[PDB]
Amino acid sequence: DQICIGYHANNSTEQVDTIMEKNVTVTHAQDILEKKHNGKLCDLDGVKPLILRDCSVAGWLLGNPMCDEFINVPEWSYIVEKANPVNDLCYPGDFNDYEELKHLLSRINHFEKIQIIPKSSWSSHEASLGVSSACPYQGKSSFFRNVVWLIKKNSTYPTIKRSYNNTNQEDLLVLWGIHHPNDAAEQTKLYQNPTTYISVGTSTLNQRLVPRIATRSKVNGQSGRMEFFWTILKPNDAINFESNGNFIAPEYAYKIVKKGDSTIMKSELEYGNCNTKCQTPMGAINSSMPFHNIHPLTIGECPKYVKSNRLVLATGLRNSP
Amino acid sequence: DQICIGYHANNSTEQVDTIMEKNVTVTHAQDILEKKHNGKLCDLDGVKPLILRDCSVAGWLLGNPMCDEFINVPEWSYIVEKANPVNDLCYPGDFNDYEELKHLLSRINHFEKIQIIPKSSWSSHEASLGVSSACPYQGKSSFFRNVVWLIKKNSTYPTIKRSYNNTNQEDLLVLWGIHHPNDAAEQTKLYQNPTTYISVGTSTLNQRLVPRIATRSKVNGQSGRMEFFWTILKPNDAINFESNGNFIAPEYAYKIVKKGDSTIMKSELEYGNCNTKCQTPMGAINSSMPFHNIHPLTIGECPKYVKSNRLVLATGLRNSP
Amino acid sequence: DQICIGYHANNSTEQVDTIMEKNVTVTHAQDILEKKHNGKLCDLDGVKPLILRDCSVAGWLLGNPMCDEFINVPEWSYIVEKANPVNDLCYPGDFNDYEELKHLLSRINHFEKIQIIPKSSWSSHEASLGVSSACPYQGKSSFFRNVVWLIKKNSTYPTIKRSYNNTNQEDLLVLWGIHHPNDAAEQTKLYQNPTTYISVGTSTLNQRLVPRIATRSKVNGQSGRMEFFWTILKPNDAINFESNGNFIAPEYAYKIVKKGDSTIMKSELEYGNCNTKCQTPMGAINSSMPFHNIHPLTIGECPKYVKSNRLVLATGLRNSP
Amino acid sequence: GLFGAIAGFIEGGWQGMVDGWYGYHHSNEQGSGYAADKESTQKAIDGVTNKVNSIIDKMNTQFEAVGREFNNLERRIENLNKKMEDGFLDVWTYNAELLVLMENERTLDFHDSNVKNLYDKVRLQLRDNAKELGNGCFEFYHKCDNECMESVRNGTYD
Amino acid sequence: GLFGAIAGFIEGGWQGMVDGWYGYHHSNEQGSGYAADKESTQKAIDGVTNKVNSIIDKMNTQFEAVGREFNNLERRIENLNKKMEDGFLDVWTYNAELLVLMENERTLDFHDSNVKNLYDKVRLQLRDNAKELGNGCFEFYHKCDNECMESVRNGTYD
């Protein structure tokens, strides 16, 4: 008669690593790395992202005519933008401090666009002739929808003195611009005056823009340049414009309302008609694992990203052959 | 008769954590996290901090009239500045490259202010009329004490040609400014000349400032703007000014002497009349613990900051019930 | 009769550390920290570095006359530059966005210099008189070799309109400059016109430079200043210049060919006539150790840098006395 | 393994013991079979569960990458930004992979320990009563019936 | 615990032994009492002291936050700056908390080890001379007087 001490074995095939030994077969193990996503861009927590597709944040905010899909967009959870969007800056130029703006946007879930200076508000200036074949809409020379390309009337550009006051309680993103012609005669044809300026002031802004003439390459069949500037106008603050030409004046500006958690994802993926609690630029994650190896940039309640191919904890004992 | 092997127990109640078990009662333990401070701002190693209270580094350096407490301050150990100090930039504007200056200050313990251009040195210009109700002192329109608001004399602003040479062996912080009026007639009233400039040169500086006119919001009952610039003037180097108006000229500049280890702390606390070897923005630390959890930003011989609520090492054995 | 279990001892003197005990003598141990270098700068993987010696990256690229050693240099593995090179910016000034250029260079192994605007191409301007005693060559006033200091001809500076097209398939580093005279009459003497500009455009560049007059310290016996700008001109793109004076025009520009892995090392060491697989600013490393403690900045197949004085693993057992 | 029981003097585990992690096999005239030792098994289930939760939890505060954009003339700070994000992701990957390696080795040894402690607990009781076979087994000098066997398991022999 | 002595076959510690960490209780006709084993206790005091100093010291070079300020249009680098400082403070917090967890577990096991080694050292000496009771105690076959007891403690039995 005989009694023995012993331990469990089973048919388990699961292996874990240790410092001294690799691929130790164990009776039980817990995998803690999520390796799977659904390869789709999905609504986050019910709330649909803003998917620009072709349009850039610039093409969207300035109101590129091909970006009409985004004239008025609802509260979004996150923004998706391609690597090299086609519909941005239709008329070539620059967007001043663009990245600082993109950054401001990452802490914003909802914009509400309101008219600040009406197009039919320019008594002394031609406001329906500021168009270009660089920005076509339905086959016809058009222009950025939210700004107005002011042009000479009866052969005069009177000094503009316009001023908007932010009576709204919500911060306001005001955008404007300046046109840089390519020679002396273009200045004459468009604005009459040969030397000009746009001065812009708020309680904290002290700006004076002066057009730079230079001969340059035809980007989009254009040698002229537009340069766009922005500010954030506080509540109870006023923005004062003064210009005698080259002025791209605000028509609309965005009230900043929601101020949500958010990111701009870079992805060449289109909307996937799904919902998730954790989204990556490659696809969404539905998992209870502590870690995942999908992509570093995520939004939501997410597992921690690591670079591993494999994370498995032993729970049972060395399984015997 | 019988002999037994055994181990210590005692009345100890101290508990430590392990990976497999939490709150293991042990016979002895060493706490290594300092959780306590004195909630005061104290002298460091005998040497009192510069406590601006209301004044900002700007309000102090330019010589805001309400910042007379700091006309001449001794060697300090560290600087304390509130989150939103009231006494700075009394006359609204900007302070050029302010943060790079703040940064330079973090490696500085002592300034010694010396006169570089005497107020009673302006033969051709009015130097006692450059005042504002934005900067009051004892009820009367006054101005930044270290700079001079030069103004037209007998209806003329002759081109200024002034130049200071740094014969001192210590580096010199020279500060100056430019006034930006809000319309054409203000320029006329103050300086006579309608188009102006301030040119500034050293061995490495090549500056030319030109006033920006714009109509803007009344910050401190003022639409005008001041913009302040600085340089560090090496030994045996000269600073050359040239201006025909809008010039805010140096009177005083600071010799940089001590060059100590230092920081600008953000704190709404006032001086506490104590001494310490390690100061945080929340209070001082007197401890021999290796770690503390008080605040990340410290100065002195300090423990290492961690985010923990608890760090306790077992030294004794599992205490038995 | 007797049998015993036991373990190895030997004459080993090698010691390792543990948490509870320091200097435990063990029978065998593996040192894993490389402590040795050869104190030389060596060819990397056969390929010799560019060793500027005295010259700076600026002195080299602009073509400082004392930097003739580097008129045409082969593919290099890495670049070495002293802390304070003497031969740079012979005529005092600035090099615009110099650090962004240095950074671009870190991902470049080969430049090939080609003529873009010929010196004997200036019909209306004097192009052999733009020299200075600040930049001597073999005892005579000379100038940066790759740019041309254009000067008035028969007492006229006609507006320059020059334009180069990048037909090459390789990106092109184009460099130019602007002269800042120290008074009104110098402008007159050199260029005739009193108010000038240099406008520069590409498909993405929109520049307009205007000379800044100021009186300043004689760095290298000079109060004038040069300011140098650069761009990267894409394939099939054109660069358009327009200027009526103060223009430092390209003669040569560099084709960017190799685009190799690379760094600029700071070192006061000269070439050592050796070859290595891993170079540091202090010397080269020939080792199979996983770690080294030589210097953080290395290039090649290198061990991982750590700050340790000692890394030794026990492999054998506690050696007995 | 450090404690020499698992795949040590006890050559291999028991497919026939599904009841728990450690226990006994008995074999006498009335028959034979397996019986999980409930408490050492439970102690082990607790240990491993707490460990996993400690492990998961310790790792919950951990570097989150934030998307950040830079223009064409901001290459130095873009690279700094990149080197920073990658740098933390490498530190955490290493932290995670190593913690797993070390704790896996500690878990396996823990099981070995629990088997050895159980073995010794039984060895202590048997005394001169049984021959210690060397293989995990004890062969009785006299006649152990099912309640004799039960008494060993329960901890009340003799 | 891994070595099975502490709160293992030795059910609990001794309030009555203030002399040191491990030792003996003896009980015969002349009386009874506790005696700390001075050298195993000292070995343990050394081990733990060195450990703490190793632990403190290894942690002395460690990220120091430097106050750094940014203007309104420097938000990207401000955030980078913040994410960097926080990132290191999280790495070090984790380093510190884990080191404590792991070493606490190693310290407790070390004490268990020292008790077991002491137990075994005595077991080795007693031989057939005493009955190993299972509980930490050895009951002598014959009559152990105080110098007999002392001889066990001192290491010179028989």
Added chain:
Amino acid sequence: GLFGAIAGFIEGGWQGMVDGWYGYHHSNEQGSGYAADKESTQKAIDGVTNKVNSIIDKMNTQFEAVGREFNNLERRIENLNKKMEDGFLDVWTYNAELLVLMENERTLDFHDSNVKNLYDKVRLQLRDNAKELGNGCFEFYHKCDNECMESVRNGTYD
């Protein structure tokens, strides 16, 4: 050490055993000498080799400093840059130094473990056949000749 064999009940190692890490000394009428236990030694050589490679390898992805330059008015980002590079180099130095400390201690204990397991394996076989001397040695009740000795080593006694 934790397992009490090395510099424990086995006072010191054997200069005379060059054959391997652990084994036997025998001594009878025909003479005496050392014989390395080939398999426990090999198990140990494997363990330590794998460990070192694990250690080296785990450390192969690790922060690389990139030279980066800043002008006179970029002092804040220069410092940030510096604090970042230093910060990672300190994290990795600590990672490396600690891993070495902990694993060194684990390696030494591993050897102790292997000696103790070998000791116990022999103890199990000898039974009442030999007197366990306390010092690592077993003194036979009867007359062990060289093939008797060999039988112990080989694992087939009795």
